[PDB]
Amino acid sequence: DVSFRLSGADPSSYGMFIKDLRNALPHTEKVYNIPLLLPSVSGAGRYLLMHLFNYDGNTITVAVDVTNVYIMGYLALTTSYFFNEPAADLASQYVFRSARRKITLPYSGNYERLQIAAGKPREKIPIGLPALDTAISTLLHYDSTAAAGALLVLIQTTAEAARFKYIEQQIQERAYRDEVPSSATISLENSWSGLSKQIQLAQGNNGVFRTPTVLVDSKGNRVQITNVTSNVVTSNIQLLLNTKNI
Ligand SMILES: O=c1ccn([C@@H]2O[C@H](CO)[C@@H](O)[C@H]2O)c(=O)[nH]1
Numbered sequence: 046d047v048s049f050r051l052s053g054a055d056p057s058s059y060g061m062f063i064k065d066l067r068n069a070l071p072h073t074e075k076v077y078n079i080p081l082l083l084p085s086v087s088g089a090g091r092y093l094l095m096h097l098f099n100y101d102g103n104t105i106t107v108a109v110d111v112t113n114v115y116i117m118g119y120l121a122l123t124t125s126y127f128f129n130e131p132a133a134d135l136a137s138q139y140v141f142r143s144a145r146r147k148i149t150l151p152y153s154g155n156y157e158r159l160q161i162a163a164g165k166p167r168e169k170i171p172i173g174l175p176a177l178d179t180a181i182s183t184l185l186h187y188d189s190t191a192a193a194g195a196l197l198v199l200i201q202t203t204a205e206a207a208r209f210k211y212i213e214q215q216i217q218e219r220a221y222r223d224e225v226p227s228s229a230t231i232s233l234e235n236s237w238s239g240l241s242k243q244i245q246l247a248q249g250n251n252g253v254f255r256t257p258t259v260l261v262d263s264k265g266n267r268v269q270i271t272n273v274t275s276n277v278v279t280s281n282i283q284l285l286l287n288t289k290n291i
């Protein structure tokens with residue numbers, strides 16, 4: 046398992062949690078020195094538990110699929126909550142079975158569906174450590190509309206930060222003050238799958254992507270990533286989704 050406490054949290058302790066989260070995801074190889082997530086894992090070993098504690102020390106446990114860093118559901122108090130989708134239903138056979146009741150959330154876990162449920166795009170939702178503390182608190186008591194917004198914060202502050210060092214740094218910059226994500230952040234989130242794929246197709250193609258990936262950079266400009274020498278590849282991305290899942 047991995048753990049993070051908001052009480053006394055700072056950029057360093059958050060860094061340590063995102064490092065622990067990355068190190069808990071298994072891989073048998075690296076592609077251009079980046080961990081390649083596994084094609085598949087069966088049984089309960091598919092799911093990592095993240096224990097998150099709000100500032101008052103209340104806790105939820107979040108279940109993460111180690112092959113794609115997808116949040117499947119979470120346990121709050123004695124009740125479990127799972128996204129409305131077959132992968133989460135499968136997760137519910139393995140994790141949080143000791144819960145006294147199981148609620149299926151009235152949406153699947155992907156950004157588009159969560160934004161609909163929440164009534165707003167994530168361009169308009171501040172993120173940071175304070176927002177993460179709020180999110181954890183929200184998820185302690187069922188409210189599906191509020192939970193959708195909280196899950197957008199949770200996904201971005203945990204999974205997406207694990208995937209990209211840039212997003213980890215963004216959250217670190219938002220340790221004591223929330224701010225809406227940069228367009229670069231949004232872009233990286235939306236391109237993880239594409240980048241993961243192109244980095245893998247690059248091996249066998251002399252480090253050149255078969256199809257370029259269009260990103261927004263720190264300054265707000267659209268740039269085209271064409272090969273593995275780009276900083277997105279050499280410094281930023283920390284985990285690759287296996288092309289077997291693309
Ligand atoms: O059950 C799900 C489905 C999607 N996602 C997130 O939403 C993104 C797709 O919109 C994925 O990359 C992942 O970060 C989850 O966390 N859980």
Ligand SMILES: *[C@@H]1O[C@H](CO)[C@@H](O)[C@H](O)[C@H]1NC(C)=O
Binds near residue numbers: 272
């Ligand atoms: C590869 O990417 C670099 C760095 O972004 C770029 O300047 C260069 O022209 C690209 N080369 C090829 C062969 O795609």
